[PDB]
Design a protein around this ligand. Structure first.
Ligand SMILES: NC(=O)c1ccc[n+]([C@@H]2O[C@H](COP(=O)([O-])OP(=O)(O)OC[C@H]3O[C@@H](n4cnc5c(N)ncnc54)[C@H](O)[C@@H]3O)[C@@H](O)[C@H]2O)c1
Ligand SMILES: NC(=O)c1ccc[n+]([C@@H]2O[C@H](COP(=O)([O-])OP(=O)(O)OC[C@H]3O[C@@H](n4cnc5c(N)ncnc54)[C@H](O)[C@@H]3O)[C@@H](O)[C@H]2O)c1
Ligand SMILES: [Br-]
Ligand SMILES: [Br-]
Ligand SMILES: [Br-]
Ligand SMILES: [Br-]
Ligand SMILES: [Br-]
Ligand SMILES: [Br-]
Ligand SMILES: [Br-]
Ligand SMILES: [Br-]
Ligand SMILES: [Br-]
Ligand SMILES: [Br-]
Ligand SMILES: [Br-]
Ligand SMILES: [Br-]
Ligand SMILES: [Br-]
Ligand SMILES: [Br-]
Ligand SMILES: [Br-]
Ligand SMILES: [Br-]
Ligand SMILES: [Br-]
Ligand SMILES: [Br-]
Ligand SMILES: [Br-]
Ligand SMILES: [Br-]
Ligand SMILES: [Br-]
Lengths: 127, 127
């Protein structure tokens, strides 16, 4: 049994973010640049959503508008499931599997301090 | 250690496919309807590619054409890692982690008989 604190230590404390009013083009370019599949959507230090590859895959082409003309807020997930430092690997795997989400932001006392994904949990398990 | 055959028994042998000449619009509608993130791209028995949410997210908007004018073959992954009934859950995962692919078609004697994803492996791990 491993804590989220320790899972984050293994993985790193990078938080890659974007603003809700930025373009989906810029968002998808940023995911490509970092080879990631999610962005924390931050406004005035508030986590207002998460933008994922699934959000893009499901929503973007259904808008009668190009990606440069769509804002992140239009397609982001607004209800964000997250974990805290005292949650465990068991908790993460259950949330990922049963909620069917690939990313779990990590929140500490009001601050987004990291992100864990399904790939992190797989990597930790096989290491 | 578990066999791929065992894993596929748990998962079931459903294969959701699309043809290479079909439109990306139709492909993404099909992923949405089935709540999946990949389609196997077949020409008769031949696995010619896999179209994934990541293909869509990385490639689609960069093309010099709209999605309804784009064919699956234009953005699908042609180089498709796969497992067979000689493989194990360990092989799966290692390959998922090392190659950064979330889906593995399962073949037996040269025929696509199913698909295993990162979510299937994680679900098996917490079973
Ligand atoms: N070889 C490795 O070290 C390793 C690590 C992670 C994932 N993977 C593989 O890559 C593929 C995709 O991974 P995934 O489904 O986990 O999703 P993903 O592509 O979003 O995750 C990749 C990595 O980026 C991190 N990440 C994603 N969004 C982030 C954000 N906004 N801020 C900070 N970090 C962020 C994750 O924590 C993970 O470490 C899978 O096939 C997986 O198995 C491999
Ligand atoms: N609770 C569950 O039974 C369960 C099972 C699998 C995945 N998940 C979760 O759902 C989310 C998405 O899953 P994922 O990242 O593994 O990718 P995914 O959405 O593509 O996979 C979802 C399911 O569909 C199947 N699938 C995908 N493409 C298929 C195809 N073309 N033909 C036949 N079957 C296909 C997979 O094998 C998997 O069982 C993740 O959060 C994951 O942890 C939950
Ligand atoms: Br770090
Ligand atoms: Br950032
Ligand atoms: Br903004
Ligand atoms: Br907002
Ligand atoms: Br996603
Ligand atoms: Br832009
Ligand atoms: Br939402
Ligand atoms: Br997701
Ligand atoms: Br077995
Ligand atoms: Br089908
Ligand atoms: Br076709
Ligand atoms: Br082809
Ligand atoms: Br056949
Ligand atoms: Br063949
Ligand atoms: Br994918
Ligand atoms: Br991919
Ligand atoms: Br053309
Ligand atoms: Br391309
Ligand atoms: Br390719
Ligand atoms: Br690795
Ligand atoms: Br075989």
């Amino acid at each position: 049994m491993k804590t989220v604190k320790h899972l984050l230590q293994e993985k790193g404390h990078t938080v890659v973010a974007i603003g809700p009013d930025d373009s989906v083009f810029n968002a998808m370019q940023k995911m490509a640049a970092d080879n990631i599949g999610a962005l924390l959507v931050m406004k005035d230090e508030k986590l207002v959503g998460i933008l994922t590859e699934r959000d893009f895959s499901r929503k973007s082409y259904l808008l009668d508008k190009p990606v440069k003309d769509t804002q992140v807020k239009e397609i982001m997930t607004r209800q964000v499931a997250y974990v805290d430092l005292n949650n465990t690997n068991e908790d993460c795997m259950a949330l990922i599997t049963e909620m069917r989400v690939r990313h779990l932001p990590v929140l500490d006392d009001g601050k987004v301090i990291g992100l864990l994904s399904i790939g992190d949990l797989v990597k930790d398990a096989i290491s």
